[PDB]
Write a protein that binds this ligand. Structure first.
Ligand SMILES: *[C@@H]1O[C@H](CO)[C@@H](O)[C@H](O)[C@H]1NC(C)=O
Ligand SMILES: *[C@@H]1O[C@H](CO)[C@@H](O)[C@H](O)[C@H]1NC(C)=O
Ligand SMILES: *[C@@H]1O[C@H](CO)[C@@H](O)[C@H](O)[C@H]1NC(C)=O
Lengths: 48, 49
C-alpha cells in the first residue's frame, strides 16, 4: 500500500513509512508465468 | 528458538496473546491466516509460520 502496510496472505507483518513507487523483480522461465499484479482502491462491501 | 511443550498444562505467549492451557495437534489446512479466535475473544488455535 501507499501508506506502506505490508500484507502476506492477509496478515500484515510490518508497515513501511512510505513508498513513492514499487518495482517487482520476479523472473519466471515459465511462459505461463503468473496471473496478475494489479492496482486497486478501497471500497465498502460484504463477504461470505 | 520456539519452545512448545505439547501435552501438559502450561502458560503461553503466542503473538502477544497470553494464557494457560494445553496444546493439541490438528489437521486443517486453513492457510487463510495466522490466528483464530472465538466469539468470546479467547484464541482457539494457531498455525506455525
Ligand atoms: C494460471 O496459470 C496457468 C498456467 O499454465 C494458466 O494456464 C492459466 O491461464 C492461469 N489462470 C489464471 C491466470 O486465471
Ligand atoms: C527452552 O528450550 C531449551 C532447550 O531444551 C531449554 O534449554 C530452555 O531451558 C527452555 N526454556 C524454558 C523456559 O524452559
Ligand atoms: C483429519 O481431520 C478430519 C476432520 O478434521 C478428521 O475427520 C480425520 O479423522 C482427521 N485425520 C485424518 C487422518 O483424516
Amino acid at each position: 500500500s501507499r501508506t506502506g502496510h505490508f500484507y502476506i496472505n492477509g496478515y500484515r507483518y510490518f508497515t513501511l513509512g512510505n513508498v513513492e513507487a514499487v518495482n517487482f523483480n520476479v523472473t519466471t522461465a515459465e511462459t505461463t508465468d503468473f496471473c496478475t499484479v494489479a492496482l486497486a482502491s478501497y471500497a465498502d462491501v460484504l463477504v461470505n | 528458538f520456539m519452545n512448545v511443550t505439547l501435552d501438559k498444562c502450561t502458560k503461553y505467549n503466542i503473538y502477544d496473546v497470553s494464557g494457560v492451557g494445553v496444546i493439541r495437534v490438528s489437521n486443517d489446512t486453513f492457510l487463510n491466516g495466522i490466528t483464530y479466535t472465538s466469539t468470546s475473544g479467547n484464541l482457539l488455535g494457531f498455525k506455525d509460520v
